[PDB]
């Protein structure tokens, strides 16, 4: 079967450089035209660059948005295609897919994608604040997980023992360049006096682990 496998994504500051790699198997690599296609919420799917086969001089082609900054190359002996990026911009942030284009038609095979984040924000763990159950059936409570970078954080409740009714929202990027999110859960009001509720917040990039007990406010 055909497999494409990317690597090399990560976090970089604006103006920076980064090289992506992709290894192919399951087809005659040197016959085919290899591409990078990126995806972001703001711009959707965008073709980035293509390098064609050695039989036609390994011609390269670039999207106008990356021309002069990106260089695509291939190494047929390693079945690898690469994307060297320079002068990176915040709007280059996205998931970068290695993809085969079938001789100027479909993108008929795609990798798993590798993530590029271009940001001047510094790595920072979150502050965790309680969302206390209201003193006025069913109650809601949670934890606010504020001002961390980069993504992701993980949130569990009671060390994983509490899963039903949990909603951990997608993170939102604040104007500060830091992320924030809330994790909430609905529980029986009667259980507020018999059961403790602790959110366990882990942020691997900063080696931050925080347990916050959430109780009714006095």
């Amino acid at each position: 079967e055909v497999k494409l496998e990317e690597s090399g994504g990560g976090l970089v500051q604006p103006g920076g450089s980064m090289k992506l790699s992709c290894v192919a198997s399951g087809f005659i690599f040197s016959n085919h035209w290899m591409n990078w296609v990126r995806q972001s919420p703001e711009k959707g799917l965008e073709w980035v660059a293509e390098i064609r086969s050695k039989s036609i001089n390994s011609a390269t082609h670039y999207a106008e948005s990356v021309k002069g900054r990106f260089t695509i190359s291939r190494d047929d002996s390693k079945s690898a295609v690469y994307l060297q990026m320079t002068d990176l911009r915040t709007e280059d942030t996205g998931v970068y897919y290695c993809s085969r284009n079938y001789y100027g038609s479909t993108y008929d095979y795609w990798g798993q994608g590798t993530t590029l984040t271009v940001s001047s924000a510094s790595t920072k763990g979150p502050s965790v604040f309680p969302l206390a159950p209201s003193s006025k059936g069913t109650a809601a409570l949670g934890c606010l997980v504020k001002d961390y970078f980069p993504e992701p954080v993980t949130v569990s409740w009671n060390s994983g023992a509490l899963t039903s009714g949990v909603h951990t929202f997608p993170a939102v990027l604040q104007s500060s360049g830091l992320y924030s999110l809330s994790s909430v859960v609905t529980v029986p009001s009667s259980s507020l006096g018999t059961q403790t509720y602790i959110c366990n917040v882990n942020h691997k990039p900063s080696n931050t682990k925080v347990d916050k007990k959430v109780e009714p406010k006095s």
């Binding site: 959707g44 897919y97 309680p130 949670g142 997608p170 924030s180 809330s182």
Partner: protein, 214 residues
């Protein structure tokens, strides 16, 4: 570049329903329109090539049609594995371009949200910032209006919303709206209110609190 307009951005389908969605090219593209499926956290997968030719291994309920500028992907009876995003792509001329996608979601009956408001914690206030959170729990459809009112002044520009993915069990959404003020601005005002308008509520719901009372 040739632009591809996909419509609708969001299409709601009931299990067993026959559905279709549209890809319109900003200029003539002949039959060079190709369709892809992308499931949550997955990669695009080629489904249909040259408007109407199905790829091998792709189930027969998928069919494509169209030529010139207006193209259609049809699913004759959606199955739950078809809940995903769908993209079109043209290869008529360079550079190759993609549409913005149509998201397929599960249609269910209307469900009203349960609404909750949370004042900023004393801990956070001690740090110079106040976040006020309004929660809409397990509702459908996704469209809802959440307005913050602070001493009767409608807030604009200082709140952010987040929405969960559709729940796998009850097909609802949940939503947070977070109002962010400086500690000094928070302490200038007394009454903090979140008002929620949703199809499932016979009248809009307001949750509120007086700063510093409990």
């Amino acid at each position: 570049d040739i632009l591809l307009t996909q419509s609708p951005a969001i299409l709601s389908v009931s299990p067993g329903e026959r559905v279709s969605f549209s890809c319109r090219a900003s200029q003539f593209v002949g039959s060079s329109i190709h369709w892809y499926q992308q499931r949550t956290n997955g990669s695009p997968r080629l489904l249909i090539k040259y408007a109407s030719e199905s790829m091998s291994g792709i189930p027969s309920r998928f069919s494509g049609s169209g030529s010139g500028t207006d193209f259609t992907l049809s699913i004759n009876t959606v199955e739950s594995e078809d809940i995903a995003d769908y993209y079109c792509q043209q290869s008529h001329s360079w550079p190759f371009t993609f549409g913005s996608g149509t998201n397929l979601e599960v249609k269910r009956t209307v469900a009203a949200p349960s609404v909750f408001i949370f004042p900023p914690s004393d801990e956070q206030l001690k740090s110079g910032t106040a976040s006020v959170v309004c929660l809409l729990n397990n509702f459908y459809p996704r469209e809802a209006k959440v307005q913050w009112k602070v001493d009767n002044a409608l807030q604009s520009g200082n709140s952010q919303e987040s929405v969960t993915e559709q729940d796998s069990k009850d097909s609802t959404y949940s939503l947070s709206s977070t109002l962010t003020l400086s500690k000094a601005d928070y302490e200038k005002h007394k009454v903090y209110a979140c008002e929620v308008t949703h199809q499932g509520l016979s009248s809009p719901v307001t949750k509120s609190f007086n700063r510093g009372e409990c």
